[PDB]
Symmetry: C3
Subunit: 289 residues, 3 copies
Amino acid sequence: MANGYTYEDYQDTAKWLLSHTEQRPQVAVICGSGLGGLVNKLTQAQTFDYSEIPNFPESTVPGHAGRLVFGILNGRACVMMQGRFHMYEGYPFWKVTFPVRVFRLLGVETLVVTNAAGGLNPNFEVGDIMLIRDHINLPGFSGENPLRGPNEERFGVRFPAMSDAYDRDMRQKAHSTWKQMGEQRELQEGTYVMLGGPNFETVAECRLLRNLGADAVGMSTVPEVIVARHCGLRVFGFSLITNKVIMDTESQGKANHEEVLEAGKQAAQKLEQFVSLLMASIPVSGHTG
Amino acid sequence: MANGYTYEDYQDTAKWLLSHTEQRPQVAVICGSGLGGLVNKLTQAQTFDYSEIPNFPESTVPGHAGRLVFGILNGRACVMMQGRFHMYEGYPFWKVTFPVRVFRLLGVETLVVTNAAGGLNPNFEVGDIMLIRDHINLPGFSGENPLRGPNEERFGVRFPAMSDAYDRDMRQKAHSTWKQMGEQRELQEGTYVMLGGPNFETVAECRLLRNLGADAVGMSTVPEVIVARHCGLRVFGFSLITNKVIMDTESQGKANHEEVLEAGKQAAQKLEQFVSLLMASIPVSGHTG
Amino acid sequence: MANGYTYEDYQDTAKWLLSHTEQRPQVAVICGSGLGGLVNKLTQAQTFDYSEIPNFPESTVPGHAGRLVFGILNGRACVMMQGRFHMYEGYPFWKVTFPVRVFRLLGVETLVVTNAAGGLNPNFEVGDIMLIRDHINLPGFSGENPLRGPNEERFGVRFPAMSDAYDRDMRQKAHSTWKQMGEQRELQEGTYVMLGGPNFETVAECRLLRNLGADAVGMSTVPEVIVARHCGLRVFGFSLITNKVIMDTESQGKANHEEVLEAGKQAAQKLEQFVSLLMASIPVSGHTG
C-alpha cells in the first residue's frame, strides 16, 4: 500500500475548515468510546458532517456519529471527531489517519485519544479506565502501517521513534487529577494491543495477547498515534474497559457486543468528566490563561 | 482489501446449483488433506468442476482436484469440495471463502473442515488425527481477514464472536465415536495456528509458534471457519498430522513435502472412515431419520 | 498481492547485463549497512545505476547509493547492490526481491547479505557483528511474502524449506576466519527478526520481540533470503549491531537514527574487511583457483 493524499490535499482541507469557523483549537480529541456526552459539554459548539468536508472519509460503523465538532471544553478550545475510522471498514491506514494531519495544519498541538477495549489484565474490572502507557502494533509487524510509501518531509522524518509516544508529563497530570476526583477505584495504566478485527478474539488468542504483555485489546487508535507522533503532536489517551475477556474454555464463551452498556452510561460519564478537567492541565496558553 | 462479491453473486451461484441437481445437502465438507477416498464413499455422486460453476474461483495447488461433489455419505446427503483455495495462490480471503457462503444459501447447516498440518505439540506422532479445539489466526492480527470491508447484514453481524467456533457437542461426539472405532492411539485435540505460506517454517519460527501455545500449524482453514461462524454454520474440523516439525538446529532440517505419504494412504484412510461415521451423529434429520 | 514480473522479464534484464560487461560473477553481495567502503575494495569496478537497468526498481531511502557494481573483491569476481529496497518505501516484495532472481540468471551461486540491526540480546554491544543463524519473518505470518501468487516452476518449488536457509559450511568458515583476524571481541551469532518499519520500536514492542527469541531486529533482508533459497542460491549474512534497544521505560527512550555513526565508520570497516577475506573461503573455483 502507499499514501494517496498529497500534502496539498491536507492543506486544502485545513484551509476549508479555517474559512468556515473563527475557532482556532489547540487540542484535538478523537472519541472512539461511545462518549456522545463529551460533545454535550462543548460550549459554542459548531458541527461539520464528514461528507461535507473536502477529502474527509465517511464513518460507517454504528455508534459513530460521523461528524467533526469545534467547541469550548472547560475553557479550552478544541476540535473533536465524534466517531473514528477503522481498517476493518475496508479503509487503508492513510485514510484512517487523514484527520490527524489536518489537525496539525490547523495549528493543533495536543491530541487526546479514547477507545473501548477488552481487558486482558486480570486485575482490571469492567468500567475501569486505563491510561495508555504504551502499545503493541500488531498490524505494523506485517507492514500494514499508515506511513508506508514515500515519506512526506513536510510532516516528519522517515524513521520516527515510538518509544515515547504517550506523553509522560500528561500521564502524571492524569494521575494527580484522578486523585482530586475522589474516586474509589484507582486509575489503571498499561499497554494497549491493536489487531485488525472485526470479529472478537478466541480464548487461545486472548491468552496469546496477554502472554505477550498486553493489558487491553482493541481495533483502533494505534495508527493515529503513529501519524500524530510522526508530525509532532503531543499524545495521550485512555481505554474504557468495557469487558473482561474469556480466558477459560468452559464459561460464557461467546464475546457478544454488550460494550454499549458501559458506553454512554456507566464509566463513560466518568471518563468524559475526567477529560474535561484534564483540559485545564494541558500545556500551552488558551484555557483562560 | 474489501469484498468484491455482492449478495446477489452468491445467490446466482446457489440458484445455479439448485437448478442442476435435485440433491439438497445439509452438511458441507471441505477436504484439504489429500482424502480423495472420501469422494469414493459417496453414493449417487454428481460432480461439478470449479470452472463450470458461475463465480467459482479455480484451484491451482497440486493434489487439489478442483471440483464440487454432491452425494450421499453414510446415509447423509452432503456436498464436498475436493480441494480448497489458499491465500498463497494469490487469492484474497473473500475469494478463498466464497463457497462457504454459497453453502449457507443452499440450506447447509453444518460445515466439516479437514486439513494436513505440521505437529508442534511434542506428544503428537505422525499420522495422528487432531480434533481442532481452537485456532490462532495470525493473518488476522495484521488485518488480513475475509470479513474486511462493508459488512453484509444478510449474512451476519459486524463483530462476530470466535471463542465458540468449534462446536462442542460435535467434539464430544468425535471422542465417543473414536472410542467405538477401537483405535489403539488416542484422538488428539488442540489449537491450530495458521500462517500465509507457501514456504515451510524455520526452526526459530516453529519454536515461536509452539511457545505461543500452538499444537499444529497449517496454511488454511481458519478463514473458512470465520466466514462460516459469521453466517451461522455449525463448525468442527480435523487436522491430519502429516509430520513432526524440527525444533533443533542439528537434524534432518529441511522440511520437505513428503506429506503425500500420509495423504491418500496411512492415516488419511482412517480419517475418511472416521468422517463417514460422524455423519450419523451430526444433528438434524436427514440421515435416514 | 501477486507477482508482476514474468520469467522473461528477469531474462531480458540478465541478458542486458551480460551484454554490457564481460565480467561473470559467481557471488552477489547486497549491502544494506552503510558500507560504501566495500565498493572501494573492488578492482576492475564497473557501475550501473538502477534507473538505467531495464525492469530495475529505484532506491529512495537515504544512504542507499542506488547502483549495481561489478568488480573483483579479493580475487573473487562479484556483483553487489550498493543499497537495497525495503517494503516501507511502498514496494511490494516481488519488486524488493527482483534483483535476487536476476542474479540467479547471471550464473551467481552464492548470495551474501548484510544489514544494520538493533540489538535485542543483552550481551550484544554496539559495533558487534552478528552472523545470522536463523530468522523470524513477521510479515510472512500475515501472508505478505515475496512468493505469494502463482509459483514459477523454472525458479523453484511451491513449498520450499527455510529451516536451512543460512549455509552452515559458510558459518563455520566465518568463525574460523574471525579467529584469524585476531579480534578482541567474539563473533556473535543469532536469530534476526524482521518487521515492516519505518518507525522504530517501542519498549513494549522490543520486549515482545526479545521474549520471542529474537537477537536483532531490522526492516529488510528476510524477503531476499526467501527468494534466494527458493531459486537455490547458497545464503549467509551479517548484521552490524548499530545500537542496543531500550527495554526500560525510564531512560534515553527515543530511538533516534544515529546508526550513521557505526555505518561507514566504527564497525563497518571491520565488517568490510571481514567480507573481503571470506571471499577466498567461498566454495567453487574463481578466486585464483
